[PDB]
Amino acid sequence: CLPPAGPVKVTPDDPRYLNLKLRGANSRFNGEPDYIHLVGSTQQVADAVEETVRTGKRVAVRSGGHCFEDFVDNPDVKVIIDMSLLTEIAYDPSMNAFLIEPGNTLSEVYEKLYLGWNVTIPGGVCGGVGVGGHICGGGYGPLSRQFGSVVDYLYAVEVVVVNKQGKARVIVATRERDDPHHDLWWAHTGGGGGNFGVVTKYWMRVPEDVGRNPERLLPKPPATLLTSTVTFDWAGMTEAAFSRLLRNHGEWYERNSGPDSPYTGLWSQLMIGNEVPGMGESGFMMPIQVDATRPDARRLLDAHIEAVIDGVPPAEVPEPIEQRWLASTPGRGGRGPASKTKAGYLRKRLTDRQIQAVYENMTHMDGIDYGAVWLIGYGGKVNTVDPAATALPQRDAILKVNYITGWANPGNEAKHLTWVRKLYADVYAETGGVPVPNDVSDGAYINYPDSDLADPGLNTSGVPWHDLYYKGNHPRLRKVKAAYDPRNHFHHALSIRP
Amino acid sequence: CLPPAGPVKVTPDDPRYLNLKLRGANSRFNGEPDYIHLVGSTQQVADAVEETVRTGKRVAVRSGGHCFEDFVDNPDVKVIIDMSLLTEIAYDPSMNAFLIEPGNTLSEVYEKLYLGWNVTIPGGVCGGVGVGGHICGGGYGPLSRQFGSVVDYLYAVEVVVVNKQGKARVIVATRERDDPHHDLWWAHTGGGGGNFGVVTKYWMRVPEDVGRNPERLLPKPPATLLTSTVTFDWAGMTEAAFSRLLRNHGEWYERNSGPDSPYTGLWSQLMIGNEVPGMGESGFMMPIQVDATRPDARRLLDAHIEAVIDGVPPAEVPEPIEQRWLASTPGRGGRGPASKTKAGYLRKRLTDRQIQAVYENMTHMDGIDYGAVWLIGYGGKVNTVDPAATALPQRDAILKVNYITGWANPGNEAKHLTWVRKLYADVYAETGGVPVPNDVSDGAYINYPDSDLADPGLNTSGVPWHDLYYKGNHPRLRKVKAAYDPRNHFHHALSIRP
Ligand SMILES: *Cc1cc2c(nc3c(=O)[nH]c(=O)nc-3n2C[C@H](O)[C@H](O)[C@H](O)COP(=O)(O)OP(=O)(O)OC[C@H]2O[C@@H](n3cnc4c(N)ncnc43)[C@H](O)[C@@H]2O)c(*)c1C
Ligand SMILES: Cc1cc2nc3c(=O)[nH]c(=O)nc-3n(C[C@H](O)[C@H](O)[C@H](O)COP(=O)(O)OP(=O)(O)OC[C@H]3O[C@@H](n4cnc5c(N)ncnc54)[C@H](O)[C@@H]3O)c2cc1C
Structure with a gap:
């Protein structure tokens, strides 16, 4: 001692x-x-x-x-x-x-x-x-x-x-x-x-x-995770193909994020971003992992993919590799790039005009080094706890959605900020630019802080920042x-x- | 506790x-x-x-x-x-x-x-x-x-x-x-x-x-270190230019490895390898660092470079970057490729025929994924201690030479083993294919163990393995x-x- x-x-x-x-x-x-x-x-x-x-x-x-x-x-x-x-x-x-x-x-x-x-x-x-x-x-x-x-x-x-x-x-x-x-x-x-x-x-x-x-x-x-990453090609990705994918993906999480669903062991995030030749963990990809302890692990993974990529031509599905827990040690560098990420919760899937707003801004991104929208899987065993039992009010969500932009040079900070804020304001346009608790949105998550929600110039709705994060x-x-x-x-x- | x-x-x-x-x-x-x-x-x-x-x-x-x-x-x-x-x-x-x-x-x-x-x-x-x-x-x-x-x-x-x-x-x-x-x-x-x-x-x-x-x-x-990495191009690396470089680098460490030397704060390893398409920390390069606490760190750095790169056309010297101690320690994974490294000490520079042996084997390397000869900077304050005072006898050396091969496929092992053992036997050909304590060589280093030295086939001299590592x-x-x-x-x- x-x-x-x-x-x-x-x-x-x-x-x-x-x-x-x-x-x-x-x-x-x-x-x-x-x-x-x-x-x-x-x-x-x-x-x-x-x-x-x-x-x-x-x-x-x-x-x-x-x-x-x-x-x-x-x-x-x-x-x-x-x-x-x-x-x-x-x-x-x-x-x-x-x-x-x-x-x-x-x-x-x-x-x-x-x-x-x-x-x-x-x-x-x-x-x-x-x-x-x-x-x-x-x-x-x-x-x-x-x-x-x-x-x-x-x-x-x-x-x-x-x-x-x-x-x-x-x-x-x-x-x-x-x-x-x-x-x-x-x-x-x-x-x-x-x-x-x-x-x-x-x-x-x-x-x-x-x-x-x-x-x-x-x-x-x-002990083991049955892992697969589905790649999507931008060149063949039209608006119709894009709208279909997000609808398929959203609908799946609407009906498979139950507390007693057999898909509690499955997790996947849909990463909608531009391709950077050097920067790893970018582009249009969807990492999917499932608990391999159960003998029916492969069926659950396969039923997940095909529901998401149904009627989606530009999709690449490799063979699911079963890897152990912590087989590769993480720690993605130390000092990362200058970035800005804005967050939102989802109770239901993104509305068709919100999906439209995403595609519009993903298509229009000149001078943007990195710009992405991730749809991270949530719910399941989370939605067993009362909204008031813990400090986290969102015990109803099925997806966490982030809007990210990255840049190498500090000179282009404002250029990128305009784009990610334009993305954010276009998506939540009907509720004053922010994810006001709704049938679709449930608010924001405090580990993804956004000082724009407190700024009167970026939050046009009357709903303050603290109501978005903490609710009741x-x-x-x-x-x-x-x-x-x-x-x-x-x-x-x-x-x-x- | x-x-x-x-x-x-x-x-x-x-x-x-x-x-x-x-x-x-x-x-x-x-x-x-x-x-x-x-x-x-x-x-x-x-x-x-x-x-x-x-x-x-x-x-x-x-x-x-x-x-x-x-x-x-x-x-x-x-x-x-x-x-x-x-x-x-x-x-x-x-x-x-x-x-x-x-x-x-x-x-x-x-x-x-x-x-x-x-x-x-x-x-x-x-x-x-x-x-x-x-x-x-x-x-x-x-x-x-x-x-x-x-x-x-x-x-x-x-x-x-x-x-x-x-x-x-x-x-x-x-x-x-x-x-x-x-x-x-x-x-x-x-x-x-x-x-x-x-x-x-x-x-x-x-x-x-x-x-x-x-x-x-x-x-x-x-507090800070002054760093530079001199790259060498194999395209203009003839036998004359190669011999010049290794003689320059060898003779410099002969004169500047004294305990009282001003270059005790300077360290450089000469990495003589083939450029592997998609893997950093390989090829023909020479990372040099010097204690930037000293008032003339830049004058000492350039003096070391000009002496090593003297009359060497394909030498590529960049601008020296000053970085603080432990500015970034990324960590190059955990599980590396399958490799076989053979080592040796150097009290004086490699002889002309030994440099010849290195260049010969570094030219002819068919099927070899990675193959290198590393000349790691040593000596200085190490040489103050008596050989018998610690378990390390080599308190006389100026460089630590390593002979490294690397393969991606387990099947190609035998091919790689032959080449690295050919390299090792060619360099130390006069002294039974091993670095028998000599005018130049001074055995091997135990943290780089080599079971080939205990093998009578790969060690064909009347000197056992332990006399190389531990000496007296x-x-x-x-x-x-x-x-x-x-x-x-x-x-x-x-x-x-x-
Ligand atoms: C992989 C690697 C090794 C390097 C590298 N660069 C080095 C450098 O710049 N300077 C150095 O001085 N050495 C460098 N090395 C070589 C390593 O220093 C040696 O290979 C060490 O022996 C590594 O030690 P460790 O990480 O412990 O390896 P193990 O396999 O765990 O142990 C080796 C040896 O030690 C015996 N042993 C006895 N007692 C113990 C205790 N108490 N704990 C652990 N090990 C012990 C083991 O039985 C085993 O035989 C750069 C790179 C990339
Ligand atoms: C690259 C990256 C990946 C991420 N991935 C995920 C993810 O996968 N899942 C997820 O849920 N979140 C993720 N996050 C968000 C992360 O969980 C939050 O940003 C979290 O607040 C980070 O805390 P920290 O202590 O590491 O950083 P810090 O900046 O040290 O902590 C953030 C805040 O905690 C406050 N604080 C108060 N008390 C303490 C204390 N005792 N110790 C430390 N801080 C204290 C600090 O003042 C600061 O305001 C990620 C963030 C990054 C940058």
Whole structure:
């Protein structure tokens, strides 16, 4: 048993500074903090937080740096509390749950959970994403249809909070109702990070009583995944062929995203993008994976493809290769390109005029390096939980839809922004440019933040940003915010305001 | 301090088996063990070793799986002890040194040592190389010319050994003179892994008394590095131009590998290979890095280049890019292609007839997917230590030469093996086809093991394999081998035998 790495205050002249300053995934955002505070223990965080209160310096937390907005990297932020050293992944006998510290990467968590106890959490696809912001934002992934969101497995949370006088306090907030700080736990079941305080620990556990046996405490990953990726050719893709595909795909998820459907083990995202000769994971492709544990795994995959590619000429279907769980270790580089992604939920399939709006903007994209629309699979075991039981209100969705643009040169930022905002405003034109909760839309997802939803120039409808993300859960979140962060010390562009 | 990850005994029907079986780097080697023993603590290691004594099963340890031989992955090995869970990197006040556990990936070690204390160890370039085999095998890297080998910083080691009755015993061996197990420490200063017992902990520390301050205990890495990669075109690479280059590069390292040399902060490996259509880090190239902390880094860089590329027409020199320490460590996958690499030391430059031999074999390479001769920069601060002081005798060399082949198809192995062995036998033709300690050669390096040297067919000289690797230090290693492994429980193709 050893002492943790002590607190290190990384000033601009210190050689580590530039590394910690630029470790954000999105290269759009550049903050110039006074110092970056590296922490190794909960107490070090408390000492860091108190100093930011005492000095009146704007503080932001960072674990993975995979924030889509400038919540960490902006001119106004003067202190970055960097959770890089807090990387513990172990079973806690005291809590009878798995302790996952914020500074861990999803790739590092899946790795340690798999080899150690043959378990996993239904988190993000990307290996490079950090735990801290991912979980309390309501993390989901390719196993979410089979197990739910990660927040459905969040038992407890250790948070550092500031009282009105300005002093730090460490609270362990649990799931149980007899806990005095039940509200604080609930705020972290998809309430988004950078609001209530600094999370120093996550405790992950299956809600049901499975005894002290640790291998039952978290979802068991499929031993093998039966994987296939369907390619589509733009050159032969007409409007009629495009409308058919999205209708086929949308309809399939309308009737196969049930909680007790045999397609809970199947996940696929339809990636509608332009082709970049060098950039991998682009173009017009549809990665599809199914749980291969069941003997009828191949039928489920085959019945999925043919329903989607029915009457769709330009489609390429290779032979489904059965690969093991974590056969190839992820971690898509470090510093990514400058990008802007806008998000929306789907209860039903995209309307025919929305599909038309997608095709129009995908056809008209001159001077765009990368521009895509992804239709990520959702629902299933997610839609068993009450909209109010967790901080995530969207317990009705079948698809998550993202609108992405990327660019190599910062000079063309405005050029790309216009296109992705034109795409977004054309699709949700009938509901004031934004996915207002409807029979089709259900709102937005806080792990995909969009500061345009708070801007009056980009959100023409009267519906505010916080109603789009939180819906009926919003009034409760302000109640938590005012209780645990009355000084409003933790804030950003899309922070909860009392 | 939560209890360590429990001992999981991975049987063949277990979903984890194939992942843990195939996590070796070189895909030429396969093995079918009865079980793979994952361990979380030193006690779990000792218990696993005793079980293999009781069952009589042949055992092999694994950290990063980056063995260039069949030491871990061979049909005879029935138990793998996997150290993946033992990944601790913290400051140890008891030893006043840095505790680094074997299961750690090198990339992770530099990352945590840099962030936590602004320190580093002068070890390997490759990211996914495990600490376990690396340090006890006399690990080296770019900073070795300025700091020496990693073994020059090895203060202590925790080893699990077996007495002749078959019982496990945990021993902590230190650098100190009075230590009753000084020999066991010396055994791990370049003696190679898989010999004396299972290494469960390393302790890294500067020899000088620097006090209790952790920031002083290890070398502080350069803040920034000045980098350049000189490309060479095979199209204009005649025999005269080739001989000129290797003579220039050879003679430069003859004059500039002194411990007092200003070029101790400069490192360059000459990669003489064929350009593989779709695979980076191959072809005819020469990456050069220099410590940008020095006031004349650019004057030293260009001086090194102009001397090497002197009278070499197809040399292509780019503009030098300055990048910070650990600016980006991407990680080039996990499972690499099947390769066979043969190594050797160089005290002086390759003779004209040896350069002739290289050019001859680099011209004629039909069916060869990849084939290269690497001349890795060495010496400098390494050469300060006495040959007998550590287990590494070669404290005189200026370069480390590697002879590498690579194939994509398992069928084409025999063809590739013939060519690389032809290359090796052609270069060392005067001294029995091996680098017998000479005016030029100085044996081989143990972290690049070569079982061909123990083979009487491929090694046709009156010099055995161990005299090449260990030289004068071999007799003493046999003594330590007999003292701490009398049963010879830990053995492979190139293990120390009494
Ligand atoms: C694949 C690879 C290797 C490299 C590369 N570049 C290097 C460099 O730039 N400098 C170097 O000094 N070395 C470089 N190497 C070679 C590696 O350093 C060696 O091949 C190491 O031996 C690798 O160690 P490891 O990752 O642990 O490989 P394993 O197969 O796990 O172990 C090898 C050997 O070690 C024995 N052993 C004894 N005790 C232990 C413990 N406690 N833990 C692990 N292993 C132990 C094993 O029995 C086995 O025989 C660049 C690249 C791409
Ligand atoms: C390439 C990429 C791929 C992605 N893939 C997926 C995916 O597959 N599935 C999915 O659901 N999401 C995905 N996301 C979105 C991701 O889940 C969110 O952006 C998440 O908030 C990232 O958190 P982080 O800690 O890694 O990054 P950060 O920027 O460190 O965290 C974001 C926010 O968390 C706040 N925060 C508050 N407390 C803490 C704390 N204790 N530790 C850390 N941060 C804290 C920070 O202040 C910041 O505002 C992806 C994002 C990227 C960039």
